[model samples]
Target: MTEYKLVVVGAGGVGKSALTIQLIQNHFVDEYDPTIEDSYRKQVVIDGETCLLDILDTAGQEEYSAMRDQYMRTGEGFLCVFAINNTKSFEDIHQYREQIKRVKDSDDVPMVLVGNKCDLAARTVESRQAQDLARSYGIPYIETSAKTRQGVEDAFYTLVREIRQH
Candidate 1:
């Protein structure tokens, strides 16, 4: 079986924990703890495949220099998440990319930009303007929903396919 490592990162309260809960357990964490400002790592078996997936979920602490460095100091892939309902979260992507490059194993490591909480687009804070932000770094963009579970599978699996191809 192939083993792949992926990191999911975003600013705090942007539903990183919620999305992780939904992805791992198929449930929403309505009362996810916010006190924790670190990453959670887990391993899963990819259905219909012989792959062992290792997921590293990280919280956004733009001000925490060392914390950010620790998470970025790896060569694995990345999924930079943002809450569709929060603009500030979207704006942080540029910085995340820089930090990742500084700490990643290589500049060629793949990155997938995720706009989470798609179920509530009516209240979205990030707009089309938020797009084109990823292409500058060659990262593809996708929308994900932890509540309705929309596009979650496609987003992850699509990235998986791309990585496996590369």
Candidate 2:
């Protein structure tokens, strides 16, 4: 079976953990304390081929910034997440993408630009804006609501498909 190493990254309180927890366990977790990192393993079939996904839910806090380049180096695919309610989080995604490119020395890495917390009343980043940025990076943009369990799997599976193709 093919194995994929994926990194989930974003600003603090952007619902990166919630999206991962929802996809892996089918459970909704609203509150997650700031942590360095967490890992999960799951067997999933993407594009009709079975594969193992080794996912690292990375810390978004500044204290964890020192090791981010190392984490970026190892990932085969990335889900760059940002909450729709936070404009600053959206702006930081380009920095993450650039870091990945710098570490891997490849501009064609498999990735997905994820806008999480779609259930929130305030939308700081419009889908069109996000999609346009993803377009510039040549990746797909997906909006997910971790609270309602919407598009969580789709975002992951989309990244999986991109990884397989890569």
Largest lDDT belongs to which candidate?
Answer: 2
Query: Which 10 residues in a row give candidate 2 its minimum summed lDDT?
Result: 28-37
Q: Per-residue lDDT for 55-159 in model 1, tens only?
A: 666657646557757755653677777888888888787777767777874675677788888888464555465567767667678788878888776656656
Query: Model 2: runs farther than 4 Å from truth?
Result: none
Number of clashes found in candidate 2: 0
Query: Which regions in candidate 1 have their CA more than 4 angstroms from the true location?
Result: 35-48, 63-65, 125-127
Per-model TM values vs. the true structure: 0.82, 0.95
lDDT of 1 at 142: 79
lDDT of 1: 0.69
Model 1: worst 10 consecutive residues (lDDT sum) = 35-44
Error of 1 at 45 (Å): 6.7
* Overall lDDT per candidate, in order of appearance: 0.69, 0.88
